Curated annotation (Swiss-Prot), chains A, B:
Complexes and interactors: Interacts with and forms tight 1:1 complexes with RNH1. Dimerization of two such complexes may occur. Interaction with RNH1 inhibits this protein. Monomer.
Compartments, as annotated in UniProt: Secreted
Name of the protein: Ribonuclease pancreatic
Disulfide bonds: 26-84, 40-95, 58-110, 65-72
List of residues binding substrate: 7, 10, 41-45, 66, 85
Amino acid sequence: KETAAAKFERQHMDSSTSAASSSNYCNQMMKSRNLTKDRCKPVNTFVHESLADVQAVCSQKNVACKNGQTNCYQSYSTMSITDCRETGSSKYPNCAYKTTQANKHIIVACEGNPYVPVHFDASV
Amino acid sequence: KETAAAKFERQHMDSSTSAASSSNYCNQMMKSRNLTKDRCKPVNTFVHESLADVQAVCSQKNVACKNGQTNCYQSYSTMSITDCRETGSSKYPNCAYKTTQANKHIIVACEGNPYVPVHFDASV
Ligand SMILES: [Cl-]
Ligand SMILES: [Cl-]
């Protein structure tokens, strides 16, 4: 079984690009990170910063999670992110995504020792 | 019982200001929109655009909702928004919120006739 920290890395980290460079970014990344294996994951955000910068958010601003838990943290700075969301034309196994690049604060849930991101809650 | 459309208006519309003007915006708005009545709503976004502009999103870009439903729409343009999230010092009945102003696309779920926003899904 994949650890929670490792799943977060796979689903939400893309440190190898500064930003989405085209409309096809999401189609490509959703496939390669294995998020379209048996069904199309409807919504998923990738963060274009170093793993260290994202892990650091776990010691930044403590805020409520949307679900009411108290282990969420909001980045002090904005980060480059890409939101991927299925389009109307999307139908497994032919998943199709809209790519939206933005620079926003991120909010992650953190857990464990070391205390690291395990869920992506939202961007602001 | 409040209708779904009316609840969306109460929870998510603030057309009377162009933007949050101070750190106390959320404390004030969460109280006055009756979102701290019996418990502190952990997270809530207000949109600083006309009701008509927000309703119009229901005929803009169709995208997946985070929960996998297909009735979500992403605004073509960015909108002024304020995210309100409970802080660590927050404890009912003394709710306390962090105010974060941003200009982002909004994503809403739409339902009914007329086809209007009934949930705020996310911002991008
Ligand atoms: Cl996500
Ligand atoms: Cl919200």
